[PDB]
Amino acid sequence: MPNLLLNPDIHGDRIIFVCCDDLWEHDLKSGSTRKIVSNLGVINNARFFPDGRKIAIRVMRGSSLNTADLYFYNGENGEIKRITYFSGKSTGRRMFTDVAGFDPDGNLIISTDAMQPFSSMTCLYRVENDGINFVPLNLGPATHILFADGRRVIGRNTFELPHWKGYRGGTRGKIWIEVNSGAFKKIVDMSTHVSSPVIVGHRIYFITDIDGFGQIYSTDLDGKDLRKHTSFTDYYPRHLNTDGRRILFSKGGSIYIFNPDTEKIEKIEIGDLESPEDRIISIPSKFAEDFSPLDGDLIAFVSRGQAFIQDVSGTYVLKVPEPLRIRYVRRGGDTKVAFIHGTREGDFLGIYDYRTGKAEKFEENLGNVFAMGVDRNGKFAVVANDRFEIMTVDLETGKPTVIERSREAMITDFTISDNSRFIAYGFPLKHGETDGYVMQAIHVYDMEGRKIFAATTENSHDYAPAFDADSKNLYYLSYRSLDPSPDRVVLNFSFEVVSKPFVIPLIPGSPNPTKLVPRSMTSEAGEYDLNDMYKRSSPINVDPGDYRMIIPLESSILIYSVPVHGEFAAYYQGAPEKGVLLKYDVKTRKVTEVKNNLTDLRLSADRKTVMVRKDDGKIYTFPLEKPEDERTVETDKRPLVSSIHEEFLQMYDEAWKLARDNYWNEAVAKEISERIYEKYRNLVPLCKTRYDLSNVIVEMQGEYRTSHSYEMGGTFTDKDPFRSGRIACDFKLDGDHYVVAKAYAGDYSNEGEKSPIFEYGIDPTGYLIEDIDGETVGAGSNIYRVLSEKAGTSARIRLSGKGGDKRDLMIDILDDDRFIRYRSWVEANRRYVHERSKGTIGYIHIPDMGMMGLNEFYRLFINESSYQGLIVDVRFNGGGFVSQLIIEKLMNKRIGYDNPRRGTLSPYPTNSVRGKIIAITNEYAGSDGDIFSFSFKKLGLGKLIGTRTWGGVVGITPKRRLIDGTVLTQPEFAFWFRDAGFGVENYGVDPDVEIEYAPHDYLSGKDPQIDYAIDALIEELRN
Amino acid sequence: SNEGEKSPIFEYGIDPTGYLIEDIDGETVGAGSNIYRVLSEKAGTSARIRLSGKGGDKRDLMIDILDDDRFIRYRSWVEANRRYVHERSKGTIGYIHIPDMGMMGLNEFYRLFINESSYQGLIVDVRFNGGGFVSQLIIEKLMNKRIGYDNPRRGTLSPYPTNSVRGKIIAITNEYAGSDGDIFSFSFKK
Amino acid sequence: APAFDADSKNLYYLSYRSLDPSPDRVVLNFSFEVVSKPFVIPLIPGSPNPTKLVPRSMTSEAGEYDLNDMYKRSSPINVDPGDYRMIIPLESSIL
Amino acid sequence: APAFDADSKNLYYLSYRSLDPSPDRVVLNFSFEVVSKPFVIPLIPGSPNPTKLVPRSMTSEAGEYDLNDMYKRSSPINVDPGDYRMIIPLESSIL
Amino acid sequence: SNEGEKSPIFEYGIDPTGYLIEDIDGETVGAGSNIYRVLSEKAGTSARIRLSGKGGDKRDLMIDILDDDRFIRYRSWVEANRRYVHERSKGTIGY
């Protein structure tokens, strides 16, 4: 049982590497292997210092490894020590805050976006006094820095890209070298991505797949004389590292050595190192899914692919006897439950009787199932799959029967009448193939006659169908009550409260039951007649709002309501959507609140019990008759038990099937998936930790050679994330004291855009920081670590000014200050533009195409769109989906003015840009950023300035997570431009004028890209 | 399926077209009894109406007597023009009417825009437009140029921008469109 | 909506500055619906946002009125964003 | 203090068996002050302590009366020890 | 009759002595399945246990899996000595 070895480094005969997230060292001379450091979190990079005495180490913490910092390991005394307290953000595809290289004097040079407004701005800093102080090199963003013959070699974006084989975009790794003490030239710029540069003698060795597979290459210090030294065909090589003589790298889980002298490649024999306990225990609540009420006050829930039946308190628990990946569980009878069991072949329906203990699985492959329900009488189930079909499956014969198939989207919103006769469901549809909007109408399936009837017209979005207990009326919701609500900042309007409930009596002539028409004044009788039932529809007298569920009861109607709210937290922090359960009394039309702070709600079969998940993340149950008697559902009394290797195998198969099933190009998907299956599946057995599995899965993902093949979330370590204390200030160690080199502030009047010290009436710039909470900081006291220990609280800080000014303040020590640094950066650019343009040009920055993007665009658009010219900066734009909404605003042409008796002219449109526009972009702008870039040119809004963009336009919409919570993304939506086709993918968008941002440009403190945009416009504005 | 867009009689499962109205709240209406006056006296309440169909069909229903039905008549006029345009264009042309440039204008524009903007051609009818101030907002939408498409592994093509008209546009106006309605007409051409 | 507190030591007011978009439920659109937030400005430099509840013994009081650069001293009060039209600072509460 | 429930399926009773000493506050001495605890015996073997709330679907019911070795089946009810003199089992509560 | 002095199985009316333990919570225990570990993963909860007796007797019970059983083992020891002393002394000596 061998391990997956990775990311090595070498020094003489000593080789260090990563195994089981820990650091190991192997002496080639003796052949002995020993673990030199563990239990620090997940280590992914280790680098010997020049003299090979000390070792710089990068480690990640946080369940998803989203934070990272650096440590030093002293092999002499076995001393471990943390060096950085930045808690740098990190993702598998961008594991920033790392070792960049070492300088002539042997000092460590780190790369980190810790104190920068953007994660792509990983600057170089020379560490001093083991972290006490960081001196910036000012060479701009870079991943590696080597020193050859007294001149610096800068590797930009040179980290590995296992998730994207064949990358050829604008963000590809390139190499630059100094030619004149402060003058740099780009020497290595190939069509493909260059990673892990190293220097042996006078040759730069690096890795690329320009020939169709990962191989080691090399060039002279001029980037000339390209040579290919390997011809690997099994697994891509990664992580080159050298001591100046021999080169070391990893490939397919094994460590290898490459001798530049002989060009010989030798595998190092290390053998079995560590095989931890396979049988693990996990907290069921941490991987909980599908909570549903059963009869007898019992509950069912799915966790980590296992399903359980238990009493509320979690004292009496029964695990459903079925192997891995039960996706859904639903009440099937008195003591029976129906469930969906997924395998590598697909999903299947099964039944389990927790009383007798009998379990039966049907062989019918239902495809990939995303919704499942069972009729109250337990005779059939209703299933929806990614084939866009809704079907019934006889719970006795297992025989399925497709009811209808949508060609637009899945039919996951359905309900079954209590008498099991009708099935109402939201049917997605479009009038034409290229419609921009998918409508949804409610269809009803009559089991008797097996015929489909339209309950609503196809003009809007109807949903949440629900039958009353007596199966006589069909209630549902629609977003049809159009009424616009005004935007409070921009001249705009949107539909915010247009949700309204409706009902359809199934028996013609029978009135809307909520209308209370006297029974003696209505001619009852009549048989079921589902024809033209949309013509009979009637709304219920409930104010429009934003409803998600309607539950008709004897004398009242429950309605799930979601208050109008901002999207920022959900979009970026996974914050849940908060709702409230409202009760509408039919008799008095009075509405009351039943429960608030909800995020989810399940209803009992008999409508007597309600299960809810609240914003606190806990599950509760309560009688719909007396919501006061609410009980908390407990699930962690009993531990979750599993086998690592069994789960690892199950996960790989699922990650592999998902990548195949959701790849945008079906044709290509079959070939690719079959070609890479075994190759990577074979490495799974070497995996012992979650990280190990990740290296394998990501490599197999990269085989699709398409953008957006990600790995997010999941649990990799039980280590709490690293902490960092910030006050939006930069520090410089001057002598024995720290001095506030810079204090950031964007718009002073906005919330969260300035050092918390400004609220005290002073600008801390040039002030000396004496001590924090009584602890002196400076020469022998790391201020970063101290802030780190105070993060999230207010500590007394003592400041000294140049004179007799001293301050004693209780300052809020933030956990982060990136947004502050960003808004400071933008506002700095804004002033600069106004200054250089002499008040004739305006400036707007767009950080991404999501909610942050909308915020910042308009935040400045309302003040900056009326200058003679306008600069739209989309550099570092992280993508999203609102580019089209911004373009729309930019496209507005000013064609008139309102002339008031008093006041000034009002331009028409109000949202029209007054003059000339120019846009700036770069290699860090991508996805929806690529689209904006391309669009800006295509629609002739103005010139595009900067460098080629990222080149990733194959979108994603993940809808399944692995049993451990991991969210993998598959490039499912390929964007196609008229005239350019799918050409943007894997290339990017070229600007009208390419303006490089060189290492010597950062050294001089000039932004040639913004300078050009400013000048180019001053020229255009002449006439 | 929309709220307040039809004769309240439709909620009883029948189309009253061609039916005879015998009486309202027990009072016979006809040659010797003004039905408009009777309805006026019942406005805002539900009255028992006796209807007779051609044959033996008879109906006795409690009907909500509205104080106004302009909006129902309007939406019906709109839907009629819509079917007519689809029919005469053989399914190639879409239709949208904008009654004014206020909150109603915004409602009706989007009500049909989400369903009518992806035909080969589009008729934007602003006849009788009563004005307001949202002309600029609607123009901004019509100005979107479709320049791309997302291609999914499953499902149909999604146009980009989502809010872009697929093909050719034509606008109809009359002497009853005015104010912001004038500005829209002038801008459409400009 | 500016408003001074009874002792004339702080100036409270409202702003439509807390940008955060809300989604249109029918059309692909977003708009700023709940972006109103109250702020406070102590008229005497060094004095903290009264709603922060900074212990009196941990604050160096005193100071004369100084309306210069008071915008730099501005601080938000911990109320969820919404659509507010008036703020009335009282002794131990705010309407 | 024996007491049968209404359906005559369980026998509830009290016992001074929960030995736990309480300290004298004046002299070095201890005494059993709160050692009374209620118990229950299901008259039908296999049937569980009703107060335990074992899900019905997880219990194999049925069974005829069998008073043999019923002390072996005795089970305590989750009430804090004290000094009880009577127990009255009701439908969903015990006095 | 005391609280906490016997296998929780006695509450179901049978003495598990000589019974075979088939499985616990659906998991088969025995030759290739460590029961000590299975129990460990159930500590503090009630788990369905399947027992087989010598004949046709088979039991399916929700048993309370304790975190400790020392006191039970202890009280069993003491009572065994008690009986032994009575027996060997022919009822003349107490313990």
DSSP assignment string, A134-167: EEE----S-SEEEEETTEEEEEES-S--TT-TT-
Rounding to the nearest 10 degrees, give the CA dihedral for residues A755, A760, A766, A772.
Answer: -80
Experimental technique used to determine this entry = X-ray
**Annotation marks residue A708 as catalytic:** yes
Q: Which amino acid is at A607?
A: R
- Of A719, A647, A749, which is closest to residue A962 (Cα–Cα)? A647
Distance from CA of A850 to the nearest CA of C (A): 10
d(C-alpha B114, C-alpha B111), whole Å: 6
* Closest listed residue to residue A631, CA positions, set A609, A646, A607: A609
Residue A139: name the closest of A130, A152, A158, A157 by CA.
A152
Tell me, what amino acid is at A772? I
On whether the CB atoms of residues A366 and A388 are closer than 8 A, the answer is: no
Cα(C34)–Cα(A144) distance, rounded to whole angstroms? Answer: 45
- Is chain E adjacent to chain A, meaning 3+ CB pairs within 8 angstroms? yes
Distance of CA C9 to the CA centre of its chain: 14
Q: Looking only at Cα atoms, what is the longest distance across chain D?
A: 56
Amino acid at site E33? S
Note whether A320 and A307 are within 8 A (CB).
yes
Q: CB within 8 A of A600, min separation 6: which ones? A: A612, A613
Which helix (H) or strand (E) element contains residue A659? Answer: helix A644-662
Task: Tell me the nearest-neighbour CA distance from E35 into chain D, angstroms.
Answer: 22
Determine the Cα–Cα distance for residues A40 and A63; give it in Å rounded to an integer.
13
- Active-site position among A461, A708, A845, A1000: A708
Per-residue b/e over A1002-1016, b at no fewer than 16 CB within 10 Å?
bbeeebbbbebbbeb
- Whether B110 has its CB under 8 Å from any CB of chain C: the answer is yes
Tokens of B92: 């190639």
Which residues pair with residue A921 across a beta bridge?
A: A946
Size of interface A-D (CB pairs under 8 A): 17
CA distance B70 to A688: 72
The answer to whether residue A572 neighbours chain C at the CB level (below 8 Å) is: no
Which of E44, A357, A293, A307 has the alpha carbon at shortest distance from D57?
A: A357
Instruction: Pick the closest to residue A192 from A163, A177, A178, A171 (CA basis).
Output: A171
CA-to-CA separations, A291 to A302, A347, A613, D55, in angstroms, rounded: 7, 19, 9, 18
Question: Is some CB atom of chain A closer than 8 A to the CB atom of D62?
Answer: no
How far lies A615's CA from each of A576, A596, A599, in Å? Answer: 7, 9, 6
Q: Is A481 on the interface with C (CB under 8 A)?
A: no
Cα separation of A7 and A695, whole Å?
A: 11
- Cα torsion for A954, A956, A961, A964, to the nearest 10°? 60
Lookup: tokens for A219 = 């060039």
Q: Are residues A224 and A326 in the same domain?
A: no
Summarize the annotated binding site of B for substrate as residue ranges. 130-132
Give the residue among A914, A863, A869 at the shortest CA–CA distance from A892. Answer: A914
CA A316/CA A635 separation, integer angstroms: 10
Pairing assessment for the beta strands A264-267 and A279-282 based on DSSP bridges: unpaired
DSSP string computed for B124-137: EE-TT---BS-HHH
Contact B12, A523 (CB under 8 A): no
Sign of the CA dihedral B81, B85, B88, B90?
negative
Query: Which element (helix H / strand E) includes D29?
Result: none
Q: What is the CATH number of the domain that holds A911?
A: 3.90.226.10
Q: Provide the residue range defining the domain that includes A298.
A: 288-637
Amino acid at A993: V
Partner chains of B (3+ C-beta pairs under 8 Å): A, C
* Rounded Cα gap, residues A277 and A279, in angstroms: 6
Residue A779 CB-density burial (10 A; 0-12 exposed, 13-18 middle, 19+ buried): middle
The one catalytic residue among B76, B118, B179, B187: B179
**Rounded CA separation A362/A371 (Å):** 17
| A521 inside domain | yes
Distance CA A707, CA A701 (A): 10
Dihedral sign computed on CA atoms, order A520, A521, A525, A529: negative
- Find the radius of gyration of the CA atoms of chain E: 16
End residue of a domain, out of A602, A637, A672: A637
Name the DSSP class of A436: S
Phi (first) and psi of residue A906, to 5 degrees = -115, 115
Q: CB E41 to CB A281 under 8 A?
A: yes
Number of neighbours of residue A344 by Cβ within 10 angstroms: 12
Of A322, A413, A403, A334, the closest CA to residue A372 belongs to A413
What CATH number corresponds to the domain at position E65? 2.30.42.10
Q: How many CA atoms lie within 13 A of A24 on its CB side?
A: 23
Classify residue E21 by burial, with Cβ atoms within 10 Å: 0-12, 13-18, 19+: middle
Distance between CA atoms of residues A169 and A191, nearest Å: 8
Please check whether residue B158 touches C, CB under 8 A. no
Nearest in space to A30 (alpha carbons), one of A242, A273, A274, A269: A269
Sequence-ordered alpha helix ranges (H) in D1-95:
none
**A643 inside 8 A of chain E by CB:** no
Angle at A517 between CA A516 and CA A523, to 5 degrees: 140
The last residue of a domain, from among A690, A714, A738: A714
Same domain membership, residue A761 and residue A629: no
Contact D55 A298 (CB under 8 A): yes
Q: How many domains does chain A have?
A: 5
Q: Which residues contact A124 (CB under 8 A, 6 or more apart)?
A: A100, A109, A110, A111, A136, A137, A139, A142, A145
What strands, in cross-sheet order, belong to the sheet with A369-374? A369-374, A380-385, A389-394, A400-405
Radius of gyration of chain A (CA): 32
Q: Is the dihedral of CA A666, A671, A672, A676 positive or negative?
A: positive
All residues of chain D having their beta carbon less than 8 Å from the beta carbon of residue E2 are 17
Are A829 and A793 contained in the same domain? Answer: no
Provide the resolution (angstroms): 2.0
Q: Are A573 and A587 in contact (CB under 8 A)?
A: no
Which of B2, B109, B110 is the best mutation test for C, with the most CBs of C within 10 A? Answer: B110
Distances in Å between the alpha carbon of A364 and those of A5, A331, A916, E43?
A: 42, 20, 63, 39
Same domain, A673 and A628: no
- Is residue A124 a contact partner of residue A986, using CB atoms and an 8 Å limit? no
Buried b (16+ CB within 10 A) or exposed e, A782-814: bbbbbbbbbbeebbebbbeeeeeeebebbbbbb
Task: Report d(CA A72, CA A58) in Å as an integer.
Answer: 9
Q: E strands of chain E, at which residues?
A: 20-24, 27-28, 45-52, 58-65
- Residues A703, A709: Cα–Cα separation, whole Å: 10
Please give the Cα distance from A339 to A374 (Å, whole number): 10
Q: Cα–Cα distance between A768 and E54 in angstroms, integer?
A: 85
- Whether residue A192 contacts residue A168, with contact meaning beta carbons closer than 8 Å, is answered with yes
Q: How far does Cα A532 stand from its chain's mean position? A: 45
**Domain end position, chosen among A680, A714, A748:** A714
Centre a 10 Å sphere on the Cβ of residue A868 and count the other Cβ atoms it contains. 17
Angle at B15 between CA B11 and CA B21, to 5 degrees: 100
Nearest-5° Cα angle at A722, A721 to A724:
135
C25 to chain B, minimum CA–CA distance in Å?
Answer: 12
Do A615 and A523 share a structural domain?
yes
Cα separation, D40 vs D48, in Å, equals 10
Same-domain check for residues A442 and A328:
yes
Note whether D72 contacts E10, CB cutoff 8 Å: yes
CA A467 to chain centre: 38
A727 inside domain: yes
Residue in E with minimal Cα distance to D38: E3
DSSP state of A571: H
Q: Max CA-CA distance within chain A?
A: 103
Residue numbers of C between 2 and 31 with CB closer than 8 Å to B: 26-28
Residue A68's closest CA among A111, A94, A97, A37? A97
Contacts with A1004 (C-beta within 8 Å, 6 or more apart), sequence order: none
Q: Cβ contacts (< 8 Å) between E14 and chain D: which residues?
A: 45
Burial readout D67-81 (b: 16 or more C-beta within 10 A, e: otherwise): eeeeebbbbbbeeeb
Strands A493-494 and A485-486: antiparallel
Pair E24, A641: CB distance under 8 Å: no
Which of A95, A97, A92, A99 lies closest to A72, judged by CA? A99
Same domain, A131 and A101: yes
CA distance A674 to C91: 72
**Cβ of residue D79 closer than 8 Å to a chain E Cβ:** no
Residues B115 and B113: their CA atoms lie apart, in Å, by 5
Residues A183 and A318 placed together within one structural domain of the fold? no
